[PDB]
Ligand SMILES: *[C@@H]1O[C@H](CO)[C@@H](O)[C@H](O)[C@H]1NC(C)=O
Ligand SMILES: *[C@@H]1O[C@H](CO)[C@@H](O)[C@H](O)[C@H]1NC(C)=O
Ligand SMILES: [Cu+2]
């Protein structure tokens with residue numbers, strides 16, 4: 001029941017054809033009849049997390065299915081983490097499986113996929129499971145619009161096919177020379193999995209501490225940056241400049257990619273100045289935040305909420321900077 | 326003589342025809358013969374405020390009559406407050422009336438009117454007095470130049486008349502749609518009187534504490550702003566933008582109003598950037614000040630002159646912020 | 651070891667500084683003297699001589715016949731290594747012999763600098779009068795036109811005296827006051843003040859420089875006020891202040907050259923500051939400025955561990971000069 005074979009098959013089934021109601025009769029039956037609140041002894045918190053999520057569901061406060069999802073959207077992230085919190089409290093696999101099946105059919109698919117992945121990664125119940133590659137679970141997030149269009153045409157015409165992916169832009173765009181780095185599907189899996197392993201929303205009340213996370217955050221991104229610059233050097237290009245909030249972003253981008261639901265990803269023109277983003281931040285807020293971080297660095301200490309100093313002139317200083325940055 | 330009738334009559338006479346020497350023979354006699362330094366027992370401060378003001382007067386250091394006055398001008402405010410301080414120390418009405426009559430004939434009329442108003446408001450001797458509306462005491466400050474010119478013409482020709490005021494700007498100026506809000510003479514009296522009741526120069530050594538003043542400062546201006554935006558919404562306009570020191574002030578203004586002495590009020594063009602103001606501040610100084618206030622808010626404490634923390638994560642915090650802002 | 655002999659030694663060492671020494675005694679010393687041969691001549695028993703000799707032997711010192719700038723961190727460090735040796739000499743023969751030895755090994759600009767500050771800050775230098783730098787390194791005080799006539803006079807082996815005119819043209823109103831900043835004595839005053847009160851001074855060199863940070867404020871205040879008096883004398887307005895976010899109105903063409911390194915660069919009129927690679931971003935200057943003003947307006951300087959150093963006291967101005975220079 002909780003053998004590796006059954007848990008793996010359950011996860012495979014839950015992630016199969018994620019944009020449609022489940023086609024597996026056993027999962028259909030669970031989603032119809034299981035009650036996340038029916039027996040709260042299955043949870044290490046006696047049902048607190050399930051109560052939170054069920055109240056949001058019953059009050060019609062959750063993001064609808066067939067809608068874009070972004071982990072950087074505060075409310076959508078909070079909704080995905082409500083499901084993660086339920087899965088994380090499950091004592092045994094049948095709780096994990098049944099809640100996953102129940103909420104798969106109620107919740108936005110992007111939120112669901114995210115919660116199930118981090119639930120598997122951060123629960124002991126997920127030990128031994130191999131998560132399918134996200135580029136086959138949500139291929140729109142890893143595949144350009146031209147190839148997706150060819151897939152839609154194959155499906156409309158009921159014909160199989162294999163379609164070649166090319167890079168975006170043209171040869172006139174020198175940045176295309178290094179598209180094989182940031183568009184590589186495995187490099188993108190590396191990146192999302194690092195953040196799934198070391199999420200910025202992690203709280204140790206979820207079960208365990210993530211050792212040196214803030215320093216690993218610095219290091220993994222330093223390595224992405226240094227590796228990209230090595231590809232630029234390999235292709236007769238100069239190193240990337242750094243962004244600054246008061247200077248133009250020289251290199252624009254046309255993704256030529258689309259969401260499954262939500263439309264095409266937006267383009268950014270060349271040589272644009274940063275503008276304030278309504279509901280996110282003013283450009284000036286970013287500059288102030290940057291200044292405050294540099295104040296801590298140049299002071300040698302981070303300032304606590306009550307004004308006391310937290311020394312960063314020690315080996316953990318870089319980690320604490322990762323935490324606040 | 327201390328009856329409400331006589332005190333009101335005295336105030337009416339002191340404020341009558343304020344740009345000319347007093348036409349009331351009894352006030353003339355007082356102004357000629359009263360000695361503010363002649364009986365220290367008149368005052369709760371043993372005569373100190375009277376000595377301070379008389380020294381400035383005798384040293385010819387006071388602003389001349391028939392000259393513009395601005396409460397925001399440090400030296401002119403200091404002079405007005407020297408007269409306030411005398412009135413505020415008078416024990417009995419005859420001291421208050423006689424000092425007011427004496428200094429009416431010695432001091433700038435704008436300073437005098439200001440000091441007499443705040444003196445009445447903040448002295449128990451002022452209880453029961455109704456201050457005349459400032460739009461009839463200094464009508465230039467509430468009446469556009471065209472109507473003042475018609476009044477001057479009526480006086481030149483010795484012919485009574487009533488003249489219609491009809492809002493600044495043209496119909497091509499969408500901001501004129503809501504001119505009835507900020508140009509309403511009563512709204513302007515509301516605003517000046519709030520600041521007279523709750524002056525930024527108040528010190529409790531003047532006799533009493535002004536409860537929650539800094540928070541009331543936030544609230545009265547929040548309500549002015551919210552009420553203006555309701556007029557904009559009523560007139561098919563969007564809400565006002567906020568000012569930014571580094572961004573253009575979109576909407577200029579032509580007051581089409583004049584001082585009695587000092588000339589026409591200055592116009593501001595549309596779409597101008599802030600410039601440094603000689604003798605006042607650099608634009609960058611405003612940005613630094615803003616940054617320091619936001620530092621206190623985001624720290625949760627104000628920093629005292631010796632560096633210690635003043636907690637604002639409490640109900641009085643908004644009041645302390647009003648004090649420093 | 652008397653003043654006459656010490657003065658002559660210095661005269662000889664500074665003679666024809668761009669060429670190997672022509673004095674047989676100094677050539678013999680440069681050939682045979684070992685700075686490490688008798689450490690009993692140093693107060694540090696040879697520590698400074700060991701540091702400099704290692705740099706020399708590892709071929710890490712700036713070559714001869716190359717421009718030198720005291721503001722270049724590594725070149726300054728090299729000059730100060732020689733200063734450190736001279737400063738450790740107990741007796742004059744150590745000072746003279748090390749000077750002669752390193753004159754032939756080190757860059758001439760570094761050597762002249764080290765020899766001057768060595769004479770000034772060693773008791774062995776008492777009674778010596780340093781030759782004017784405008785005759786030791788005339789390129790740094792003489793426009794390129796006159797140097798060329800000197801070069802021509804030497805190429806043709808004919809004596810001459812050549813008139814120096816001020817830089818610019820009569821169309822350049824700033825030329826009206828060129829006699830101030832271009833005066834060779836005013837230039838010597840300025841270099842010598844900084845030689846007497848160097849920003850690199852550490853009291854481990856042997857003594858404290860009393861009130862240095864306040865004298866730094868004062869000497870430059872007086873240069874600024876004196877320049878403005880010349881502007882007033884020539885129908886010019888006072889100088890504006892620089893700001894990092896505003897154009898530098900007045901450009902400058904020095905029309906002067908290094909002996910080695912080429913012509914001094916020109917600055918066009920009306921330029922915005924640009925970031926300087928290897929030095930600082932313009933934004934870094936603004937942040938540094940802000941931090942200094944934070945200390946001034948707080949009334950205290952913040953120490954490395956966060957504790958406050960009160961500057962509301964007579965030494966505050968000195969501490970400000972310490973942190974501003
Ligand atoms: C002024 O207003 C009154 C009433 O609104 C009107 O009777 C009168 O004609 C007006 N005068 C002019 C000059 O418009
Ligand atoms: C140089 O100046 C001197 C005096 O200042 C003058 O006698 C001489 O004519 C000048 N020489 C030239 C070439 O102008
Ligand atoms: Cu990342």
Ligand SMILES: [Cu+2]
Nearest residue numbers: 516519520546
């Ligand atoms: Cu107000």
Ligand SMILES: [Cu+2]
Nearest residue numbers: 840843844870
């Ligand atoms: Cu200097």
Ligand SMILES: [Mg+2]
Nearest residue numbers: 345346390430
């Ligand atoms: Mg008068």
Ligand SMILES: [Mg+2]
Nearest residue numbers: 606610611614
């Ligand atoms: Mg200011």
Ligand SMILES: [Mg+2]
Nearest residue numbers: 713716717911
């Ligand atoms: Mg070079």
